[PDB]
Design a protein around this ligand. Sequence first.
Ligand SMILES: [Cl-]
Ligand SMILES: [Cl-]
Lengths: 193, 193, 193, 193
Amino acid sequence: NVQERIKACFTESIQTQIAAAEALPDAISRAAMTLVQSLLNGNKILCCGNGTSAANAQHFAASMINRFETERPSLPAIALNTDNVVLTAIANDRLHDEVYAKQVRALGHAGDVLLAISTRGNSRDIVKAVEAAVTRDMTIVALTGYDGGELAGLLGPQDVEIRIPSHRSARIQEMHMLTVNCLCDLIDNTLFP
Amino acid sequence: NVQERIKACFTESIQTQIAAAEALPDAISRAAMTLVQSLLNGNKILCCGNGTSAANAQHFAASMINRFETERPSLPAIALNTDNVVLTAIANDRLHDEVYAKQVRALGHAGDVLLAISTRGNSRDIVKAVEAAVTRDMTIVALTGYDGGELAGLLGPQDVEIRIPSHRSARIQEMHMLTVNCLCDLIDNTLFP
Amino acid sequence: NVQERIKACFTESIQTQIAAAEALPDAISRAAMTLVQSLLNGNKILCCGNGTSAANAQHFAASMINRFETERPSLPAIALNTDNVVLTAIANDRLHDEVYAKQVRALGHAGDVLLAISTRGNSRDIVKAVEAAVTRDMTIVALTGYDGGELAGLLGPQDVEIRIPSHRSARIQEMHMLTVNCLCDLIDNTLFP
Amino acid sequence: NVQERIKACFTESIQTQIAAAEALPDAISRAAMTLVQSLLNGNKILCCGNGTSAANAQHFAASMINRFETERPSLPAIALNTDNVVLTAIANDRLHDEVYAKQVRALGHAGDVLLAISTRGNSRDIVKAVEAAVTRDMTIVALTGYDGGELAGLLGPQDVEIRIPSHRSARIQEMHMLTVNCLCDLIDNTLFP
Ligand SMILES: [Cl-]
Ligand SMILES: [Cl-]
């Protein structure tokens, strides 16, 4: 009955992906257009997330800087959750909520995109990255789940939320990796048919 | 027809997950038992991977050290692909293939597990981590795809290969995240019902 | 007068290093003996720090795992401030003070050493790493400055504080890198004359 | 006579710092002016290094993004040796020498600075970061030792080499941390007297 639990886990995933295929392609499409437009304008994509969403952010970053599938030029994407010295320096001062906001304020240019990844969309550090990006006239592409959290409360007319239809963090994280992969596909197919 | 590409990408994923649910539960089961046994013996799990597989490794590590879902004690797992100072120091000497093997040799104890994650199973650095782990009398749980690569050539009777049935790296990486999530489920359900 | 400021900065450093050469060799000696003894017993060294002290920790870790100068076997040292996915997962749950304590609890064995590096010795996350290490019957080698902070309040008869005689963080950090280098020297000269 | 070795190590350091105070303030001055000018033009500083030089790079990055001493706005500096997922993805493709060059090509703008840190200045990955930065019309501030290596062979009229007068890597690394600290001092004193 280990085999049963494994079945259940696989099942729940498949059900989630089916529901996401029905609900998300318009949002994915919009996000992809935003990322493509920013990159075409010579802008870059700043990415942030915590935990597994940090891993997903780095996944995006690497797909852009190195490659997704096609040999093509390196594209400008930075994950803000990788420099442990920066992150812990800010935490050491007592500024845990500003770990990504400081980076966005120092590095963001108008026309850049903040790709913000969160399962619940509630963490204060991500909220603040988004609100410093808005300040900087960047557009937001948010990957979320549950009800979208504080994060979805922050998005304006130009911004895009991709809200996985799931109240389960593990499933949400899996859908975020797929979503990022569908985005890299679109981006490469568009910029380098 | 952006919506079509997105459909195709979602489709290919769902097809992969279905085929993995049919083919992998015995292997996942075996891996889970190995990880559980090692942890019960007071041992730890060393994890390594490159690129997105590095992200997947860290995902595992974090699920163990922090939590997967249930509040329970931190469990000992280390990703060997996180200390950038260590990794680049070894690359700076001209030892790129030893970046993980040195770590396994310094840190591994008999009875530990090396969770090795690779889409093709061919990278020399992962091959060598596995072969230093074998030396150290560790057991190997390999997450692979394609035909399993050099990596699958290295596994003995006690070791476990989880070979995603896919010749597509993006799909393989997605299945690796799911597999890790099904493993953390099993591990928690077993050790902390 | 840029050249003057540079002179002043160089001067202050030299003055600090002179004062540290007078005050610290007994402490450095003791620390070195502790690290050597633990390593001889088959134990490992866990390292933590924030910001520049995180960099100094990784410096130690790399000197052990890869090499300091002499080609010799990789030695077991881990910096707990490198896995960004682990660290941010714990911060994402609201447990910022436990980022290193969870790692020490999961990974530490009696007889291991925690090399704790802090300019003031006040950060709650480092305090707690030290107090979980004590629990685990590990010995502490603390690199500190100012008055040693909460950290120096935690050390027992077996533990070692190396307190740089400086109330200036930049100077303290420089002395920490030197101290780590003098330690790697001792360790190699002792274990591999 | 442990106390003697410690004395020797402290001595050699002090001798190095004295010789650097005599030889380097013009170069430090020039570098500081370059970094200040680039930052004034709205540009950013990309930093790279391997091993301990990676740690030194992150130290710089954190001093800029967070703070050096004075509370003041976050300044744009990025270390290219922190995203382990990016770095290992490129190493996984067989492109070890391009790990930083891809990042510089994707991210660099004319007028930016590449702060390149190396004890010998020979590693191919750093050589190539520098030569992609030159392509991108960035200025180079190189922190080196020994004879400056291939790296010093690459610098043009606008670029700055800070060559620590030492043929000893540990001493060189210590002087690099001091140099970075003297630079952050200058930068803050200039931009925010
Ligand atoms: Cl261990
Ligand atoms: Cl930029």
